[PDB]
Amino acid sequence: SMKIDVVTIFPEYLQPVRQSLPGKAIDAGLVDVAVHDLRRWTHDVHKSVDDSPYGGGPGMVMKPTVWGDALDEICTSETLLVVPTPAGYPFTQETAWQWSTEDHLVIACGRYEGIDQRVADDAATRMRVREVSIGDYVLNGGEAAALVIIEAVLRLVPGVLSLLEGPSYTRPPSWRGMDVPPVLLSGDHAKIAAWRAEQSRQRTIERRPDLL
Amino acid sequence: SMKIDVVTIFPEYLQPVGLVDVAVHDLRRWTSVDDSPYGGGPGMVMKPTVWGDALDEICTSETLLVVPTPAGYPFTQETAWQWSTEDHLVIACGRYEGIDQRVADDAATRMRVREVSIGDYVLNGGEAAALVIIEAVLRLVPGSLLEGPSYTRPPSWRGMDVPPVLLSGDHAKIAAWRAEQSRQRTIERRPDLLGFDSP
Ligand SMILES: Nc1cc(-c2ccc3ccn(Cc4ccccc4)c3c2)n[nH]1
Ligand SMILES: Nc1cc(-c2ccc3ccn(Cc4ccccc4)c3c2)n[nH]1
């Protein structure tokens, strides 16, 4: 049973998430994903969510007063507050496993140059906060990261949704001049397992030497 | 100018997307897309036949074929820069337990192919990875260390003050403080970026 609240100035970005959820899991109360427009918590007629960076520099910074009100409303002391950021700790499968048993995730999606640091710092005085990066590339905001996190976590929640894996094959046995490796059709399952293990080792050496 | 084609059995997932055109194609237009794995194992594999026909129609020899997969080479910022000057990206999104390896092998006889991972976690398919790749690449289209903390008004909030140096207007002191913050953050969160052991 997990509640996920996502806060964003682009609520439509998260439409695929609510789409990918099977009715049975929602009906069984296993998962609830809610998306909130950050501008609900703006103070002014111009619905401002950003402002110039102290110390100067390019880009804009999201306002702490707006974010503070939104998180005040949405979070509780039991919330795990997830803040995507290119400067975050790495989000890995181990993280996804850990978060998969949480009762309440709140994902705060930044835009522009990010969120005033006091927002996370204030939140961390009364709840668990996790600033996380999903990889070593730069996005325009947290929304695509939220999609990735939500998918990786929820597929580990029952019934809701190391070396590298080697190549996989299915029918037909021959296609465009390329045969499925004969060992796979051999019925020697010890040999198949060893062949797969060796494929995995080779692929890891070639693609991800860092894992070795 | 860049053209991106995305191929998927879930075209609706790609909807979160003049110098660039992006098109989404339903793989099923070229047909059941999956079958049991040769050699055994859980799950299903996407059949090469349907993929071959789709890519035949969509790709040229100039195409960079991008295939998200947990077993891929890492997609990094360097990759994003490299791909930002390409004329034509085609992103083949798999589902189930992935795509028959022969699809990428066949394609590689005609075009450049890149199997890539966007990070060390497992998705249910290639669609979310396509969204990530598209965003990271397109923000670089013509037309290190971790980022430190940023602040904006008010200078005091809930009794939390903006670091006084940022209000001082001294560029050199500000540049120095931000460098220190970034180095401190990199050591703590990403020690690997500075050549140290991971936690
Ligand atoms: N792994 C990962 C995470 C992000 C991410 C997350 C949230 C935000 C909010 C704004 N931006 C844009 C930005 C560009 C440069 C410097 C700071 C912020 C974000 C990027 N990118 N890559
Ligand atoms: N970095 C990254 C990439 C992917 C990814 C990409 C395409 C597919 C197609 C099916 N799956 C699910 C799958 C689970 C296990 C083994 C193989 C495939 C995919 C995952 N996840 N994480």
Automatic annotation (TrEMBL), chain B:
<feature type="binding site">
    <location>
        <position position="118"/>
    </location>
    <ligand>
        <name>adenine</name>
    </ligand>
</feature>
<dbReference type="InterPro" id="IPR029026">
    <property type="entry name" value="tRNA_m1G_MTases_N"/>
</dbReference>
<dbReference type="InterPro" id="IPR023148">
    <property type="entry name" value="tRNA_m1G_MeTrfase_C_sf"/>
</dbReference>
<dbReference type="InterPro" id="IPR029028">
    <property type="entry name" value="Alpha/beta_knot_MTases"/>
</dbReference>
<comment type="subunit">
    <text>Homodimer.</text>
</comment>
<feature type="compositionally biased region" description="Basic and acidic residues">
    <location>
        <begin position="180"/>
        <end position="192"/>
    </location>
</feature>
<feature type="binding site">
    <location>
        <position position="123"/>
    </location>
    <ligand>
        <name>S-adenosyl-L-homocysteine</name>
    </ligand>
</feature>
<feature type="domain" description="tRNA methyltransferase TRMD/TRM10-type">
    <location>
        <begin position="2"/>
        <end position="194"/>
    </location>
</feature>
<feature type="binding site">
    <location>
        <position position="118"/>
    </location>
    <ligand>
        <name>S-adenosyl-L-homocysteine</name>
    </ligand>
</feature>
<feature type="binding site">
    <location>
        <position position="119"/>
    </location>
    <ligand>
        <name>adenine</name>
    </ligand>
</feature>
<feature type="binding site">
    <location>
        <position position="121"/>
    </location>
    <ligand>
        <name>adenine</name>
    </ligand>
</feature>
<feature type="binding site">
    <location>
        <position position="94"/>
    </location>
    <ligand>
        <name>S-adenosyl-L-homocysteine</name>
    </ligand>
</feature>
<feature type="binding site">
    <location>
        <position position="68"/>
    </location>
    <ligand>
        <name>S-adenosyl-L-methionine</name>
    </ligand>
</feature>
<dbReference type="Pfam" id="PF01746">
    <property type="entry name" value="tRNA_m1G_MT"/>
</dbReference>
<dbReference type="GO" id="GO:0052906">
    <property type="term" value="F:tRNA (guanine(37)-N1)-methyltransferase activity"/>
</dbReference>
<keyword id="KW-0963">Cytoplasm</keyword>
<feature type="binding site">
    <location>
        <position position="68"/>
    </location>
    <ligand>
        <name>S-adenosyl-L-homocysteine</name>
    </ligand>
</feature>
<feature type="binding site">
    <location>
        <position position="117"/>
    </location>
    <ligand>
        <name>S-adenosyl-L-homocysteine</name>
    </ligand>
</feature>
<keyword id="KW-0819">tRNA processing</keyword>
<dbReference type="InterPro" id="IPR016009">
    <property type="entry name" value="tRNA_MeTrfase_TRMD/TRM10"/>
</dbReference>
<dbReference type="InterPro" id="IPR002649">
    <property type="entry name" value="tRNA_m1G_MeTrfase_TrmD"/>
</dbReference>
<comment type="function">
    <text>Specifically methylates guanosine-37 in various tRNAs.</text>
</comment>
<feature type="binding site">
    <location>
        <position position="121"/>
    </location>
    <ligand>
        <name>S-adenosyl-L-methionine</name>
    </ligand>
</feature>
<keyword id="KW-0949">S-adenosyl-L-methionine</keyword>
<feature type="binding site">
    <location>
        <position position="118"/>
    </location>
    <ligand>
        <name>S-adenosyl-L-methionine</name>
    </ligand>
</feature>
<dbReference type="GO" id="GO:0005829">
    <property type="term" value="C:cytosol"/>
</dbReference>
<keyword id="KW-0808">Transferase</keyword>
<feature type="region of interest" description="Disordered">
    <location>
        <begin position="179"/>
        <end position="199"/>
    </location>
</feature>
<comment type="similarity">
    <text>Belongs to the RNA methyltransferase TrmD family.</text>
</comment>
<feature type="binding site">
    <location>
        <position position="123"/>
    </location>
    <ligand>
        <name>S-adenosyl-L-methionine</name>
    </ligand>
</feature>
<keyword id="KW-0489">Methyltransferase</keyword>
<feature type="binding site">
    <location>
        <position position="94"/>
    </location>
    <ligand>
        <name>S-adenosyl-L-methionine</name>
    </ligand>
</feature>
<feature type="binding site">
    <location>
        <position position="121"/>
    </location>
    <ligand>
        <name>S-adenosyl-L-homocysteine</name>
    </ligand>
</feature>
<feature type="binding site">
    <location>
        <begin position="118"/>
        <end position="123"/>
    </location>
    <ligand>
        <name>S-adenosyl-L-methionine</name>
    </ligand>
</feature>
<protein>
    <recommendedName>
        <fullName>tRNA (guanine-N(1)-)-methyltransferase</fullName>
        <ecNumber>2.1.1.228</ecNumber>
    </recommendedName>
</protein>
<feature type="binding site">
    <location>
        <position position="119"/>
    </location>
    <ligand>
        <name>S-adenosyl-L-homocysteine</name>
    </ligand>
</feature>
<feature type="binding site">
    <location>
        <position position="123"/>
    </location>
    <ligand>
        <name>adenine</name>
    </ligand>
</feature>
<feature type="binding site">
    <location>
        <position position="119"/>
    </location>
    <ligand>
        <name>S-adenosyl-L-methionine</name>
    </ligand>
</feature>
<feature type="binding site">
    <location>
        <position position="117"/>
    </location>
    <ligand>
        <name>S-adenosyl-L-methionine</name>
    </ligand>
</feature>
<dbReference type="GO" id="GO:0002939">
    <property type="term" value="P:tRNA N1-guanine methylation"/>
</dbReference>
